[PDB]
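Researcher: Following up on the earlier apo prediction. This time include the ligand. It's chloride ion, with the SMILES given after the sequence.
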Amino acid sequence: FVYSTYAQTKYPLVFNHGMAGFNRVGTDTLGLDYWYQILPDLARNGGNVWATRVSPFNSTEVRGEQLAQQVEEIIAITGKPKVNLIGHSHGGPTIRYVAGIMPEKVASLTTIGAPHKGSPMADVILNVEGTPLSGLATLVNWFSAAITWAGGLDPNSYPHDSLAGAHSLSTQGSAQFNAQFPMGVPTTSCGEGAYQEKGIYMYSFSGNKALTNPLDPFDIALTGSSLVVDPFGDNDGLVSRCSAKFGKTIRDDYNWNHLDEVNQVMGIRAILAADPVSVYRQHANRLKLQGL
Amino acid sequence: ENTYLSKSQQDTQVNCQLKINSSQHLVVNSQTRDCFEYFITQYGESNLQKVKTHFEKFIQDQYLEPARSQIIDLWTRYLKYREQLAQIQPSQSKQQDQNYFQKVFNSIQDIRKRFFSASEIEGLFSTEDIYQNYTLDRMKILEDSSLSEIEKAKKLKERFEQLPEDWQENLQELSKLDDLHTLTKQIKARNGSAEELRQMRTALVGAEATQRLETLDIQRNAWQQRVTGYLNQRDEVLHSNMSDSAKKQAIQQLRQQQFSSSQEQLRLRTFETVHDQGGELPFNY
Ligand SMILES: [Ca+2]
Ligand SMILES: [Cl-]
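Model: Understood. Below is the ligand-bound prediction.
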C-alpha cells in the first residue's frame, strides 16, 4: 500500500511527543492523533515509523528513561542498530536524554519547537513573587489542571508529576539539564548547535508565529501565552525561536504556531505556509540521503 | 537542482513522483499534491513568483507534452486554490464541537469544487480525506452522549473496520508498539507462563524479535538490580556516622566500582534524584 520510497531511511523513524491530553477510548490520544497524518504519510512514502508513548507530564529525565526503553524495544523489533529520534516540544529534551545515555543507539536527533533554552511560560507558572502575574499564572495552571482532572483515571496511566515537568522546561531547569546533556545545544544565546557529535546528526526546525488561522480554536490561547513568551513575539506562542535552535536549523521561521508544527488542529494553518506533512516527508528524505 | 530548490532544500531530492499513464497522460495521485507542496514549501524563503519560476522550470526540464500542459494547468488551479482557502469564515458556535470541524471541512470541499473535478479532487485528496473523515466521525461517536461507553467502543471498532484494509494494516503497524505493551502488561498482570508470552510475542513480532526482546528483559533486570543494590549501599553510607566528603568519596568509589562509563553515571543520577526524593524508580510504566 506504500506508493514511494521517498522517506525510506536506513534506520527507523521514531517520534516522541510531549505535553498532551487524557487518553480516552479514542485510539492514540498522544500517539497518532498527535502527529496529524504525518506518520501514515511517511509510512506510505516507504518509511518505517514508530510513535513513542511516554508520560505527558513528568521530568525530562523520567520521560527520557521511559522513551529509552521503548527505543530499545524498537531496535529489538526492527533489528536495526540505531534509530532516528524526532521530538516535538518537551519531546526535544526527552530525545536528548536518550542521546546522552545511549549515543550508540541514536543515529539522528530532530527537535521541533523544543524549549532547549527553556520556556518563559514555564517560569511564569512557577512564580510566587510577581503577585499580579503570579495570580493569572496560578489560576491558568489550576485550569489546565482542571481540564486533565476532567479526564480522571487514565486507561494508559503514566506517572503524572507535572511540577517536575514544569521545572524541566523552566529557564533554570533547562540549563541544569543542558549542563549534563549539552550535545547539540548552542553556547551562544541565539546561534546554532553542533551539526554532529559522537557521530550523531542534529537538526532543529521551529515556527515563530502565534496566530496562523483564526479557525484554530487554540490560536486565541497561543496568542495569550505568546506575550508571556516574548512581548515582540518571536515564538510559536510557547517556545521562542532562540530556545528551539539545536544543531542544524533546517528553517526557523515557518508561519506555524506551536501546534501547526504537529499539523494541529485537524490541519488548520496559515493561508500560505508549507504543509507540515510535506516538510516532515522532506526531512525524512534528507535523513535517507544522509544514509540515516 | 540548485536552480529549482530553496536554501533549505539544498540537501533533499525533488518529491515530484508524477505517475504518467500508458499513453503519456498525467494520472493525478496523492503524490501529485506532494509535488506541488514540495515547491510551495519554498514560499516564506522565496517570493510567490520564484515559487512559480522554479516549479515551471523544473517541470519543463522533466516532462514534455501533453502531460506538461496539464501539470502547469493543475498547478495554477492549485495555487489559486491555496489562496482561495482564506475564504472560509468562522461560524458562531462552541468552537469545540464536531458540527464545527465538520462544517470547517465542508467549506473547503466546496472550495475544491471551484477549482477541481470529482476525478481530480479524488486524486489529490481522497487518501488524506479517508483519515480526516475517520477522525471527524470518531469525534461525533464520542460526543454522542446518548450511547453507553460500551456501545461507543463497539461503534468505534465497527467504524474502524469500514476503512480500506490498507489503512487498517498501516495503523495497526503504527500502533504495534502499543499493542506489545498492552499484551505484555496484561498477560504479566496475572502471572502468565513464559510460553504464553513467547507465543503472544511470536505472533505480533515473530521469533527473531521475540528472542532479542527476551535478551532485553534480561538486560533491564540486570540494570535494575544494579541500581537497586547500588542505592542500598549508598543509603548505608548516607546513614553512617561519617562526614559529607567521606560519604561522597565512599559513594563515588561505589559508583566507579559498578558504573564505569560516563554513560551509566548519567542514568544513575536520574534514579538517584528520584530516590533521594522518595519517588518510585522509573522501570515500568
Ligand atoms: Ca493551526
Ligand atoms: Cl511556511
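Model: Residues 60-78 of chain A form the longest helix (19 residues).
Researcher: Noted. I'll compare it with the apo version next.
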